[PDB]
Amino acid sequence: ACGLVASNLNAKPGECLKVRGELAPDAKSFVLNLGKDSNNLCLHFNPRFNAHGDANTIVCNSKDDGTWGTEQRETAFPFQPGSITEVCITFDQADLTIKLPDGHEFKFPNRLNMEAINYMAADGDFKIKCVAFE
Amino acid sequence: ACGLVASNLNAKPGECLKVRGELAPDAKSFVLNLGKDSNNLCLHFNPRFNAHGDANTIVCNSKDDGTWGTEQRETAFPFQPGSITEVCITFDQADLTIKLPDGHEFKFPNRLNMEAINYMAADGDFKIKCVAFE
Ligand SMILES: OC[C@H]1O[C@@H](O[C@H]2[C@H](O)[C@@H](O)[C@H](O)O[C@@H]2CO)[C@H](O)[C@@H](O)[C@H]1O
Ligand SMILES: OC[C@H]1O[C@@H](O[C@H]2[C@H](O)[C@@H](O)[C@H](O)O[C@@H]2CO)[C@H](O)[C@@H](O)[C@H]1O
Numbered sequence: 001a002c003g004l005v006a007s008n009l010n011a012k013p014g015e016c017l018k019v020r021g022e023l024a025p026d027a028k029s030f031v032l033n034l035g036k037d038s039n040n041l042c043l044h045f046n047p048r049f050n051a052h053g054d055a056n057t058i059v060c061n062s063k064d065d066g067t068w069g070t071e072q073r074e075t076a077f078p079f080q081p082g083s084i085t086e087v088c089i090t091f092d093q094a095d096l097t098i099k100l101p102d103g104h105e106f107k108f109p110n111r112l113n114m115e116a117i118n119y120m121a122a123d124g125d126f127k128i129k130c131v132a133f134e
Numbered sequence: 135a136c137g138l139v140a141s142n143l144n145a146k147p148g149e150c151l152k153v154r155g156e157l158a159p160d161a162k163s164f165v166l167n168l169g170k171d172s173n174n175l176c177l178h179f180n181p182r183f184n185a186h187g188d189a190n191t192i193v194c195n196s197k198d199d200g201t202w203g204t205e206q207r208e209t210a211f212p213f214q215p216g217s218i219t220e221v222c223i224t225f226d227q228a229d230l231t232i233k234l235p236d237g238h239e240f241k242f243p244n245r246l247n248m249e250a251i252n253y254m255a256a257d258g259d260f261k262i263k264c265v266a267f268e
């Protein structure tokens with residue numbers, strides 16, 4: 001139900017998205033989205049504690065005119081229910097780089113070579129403490 | 135039309151809201167709202183460069199079940215169109231304290247005696263760089 005949605009960003013390559021949130025003690029999933037609008041996402045970042053058949057797996061994807069792209073799963077899962085977590089994301093026209101709080105990083109392709117991000121959303125089983133993209 | 139809305143906060147007295155935004159070169163107004171939901175706000179903070187008959191004036195108010203309260207106008211106006219600005223807000227059951235970037239502060243009464251903030255919004259003539267409430 002509850003969530004954060006912002007359509008008033010003006011983020012560009014070289015800037016860093018930093019999101020901090022407090023994970024519910026029974027957290028099943030949370031989502032961070034970046035893009036142009038809800039139907040056009042260069043990144044959907046979805047740690048699944050236990051959701052949609054995945055356990056302790058991050059699912060990433062893109063969304064183009066409402067259509068989900070090819071999923072990319074990551075096994076690094078430094079997320080503890082009931083605690084604060086921080087995720088940082090940088091990007092350029094080739095890839096987004098996701099930096100997890102244990103020092104794991106991975107790339108997700110910038111499939112539509114998006115160079116301006118004006119939309120973000122954060123929702124699921126956590127309460128927001130910080131969103132910065134600067 | 136664009137803006138930020140979050141219903142997934144869990145802010146408590148002793149935590150500080152910090153908002154950074156890039157003001158449009160022709161900015162007329164921006165708004166920061168805090169409360170339970172869009173109809174129930176312990177603080178509506180509205181710097182008006184030139185809007186609704188006010189020039190370089192901050193208008194603050196509360197909103198109770200959809201009804202605006204008594205306005206409080208502040209003359210301190212350390213906001214420059216085309217630049218980044220930062221506003222910090224603290225609160226307790228008595229008052230919210232607004233801390234402006236030039237060191238001016240003022241209090242706005244917490245009329246609804248709200249001790250938990252789950253909702254915030256930021257919109258108007260700026261682009262968000264940071265929202266933190268922690
Ligand atoms: O791809 C992100 C998207 O996934 C949806 O669930 C997928 C699921 O991960 C996959 O295993 C299945 O094959 O297709 C489902 C439907 O596309 C989620 O529903 C959605 O929220 C996103 O997370
Ligand atoms: O009170 C905040 C609220 O003000 C509305 O405008 C007011 C205006 O400030 C006041 O001078 C006039 O008497 O009543 C108007 C309507 O309540 C704004 O429209 C609204 O956006 C808020 O900023």
Ligand SMILES: [Mg+2]
Binds near residue numbers: 002003126127
């Ligand atoms: Mg949420």
Ligand SMILES: [Mg+2]
Binds near residue numbers: 204205206207
């Ligand atoms: Mg008054």
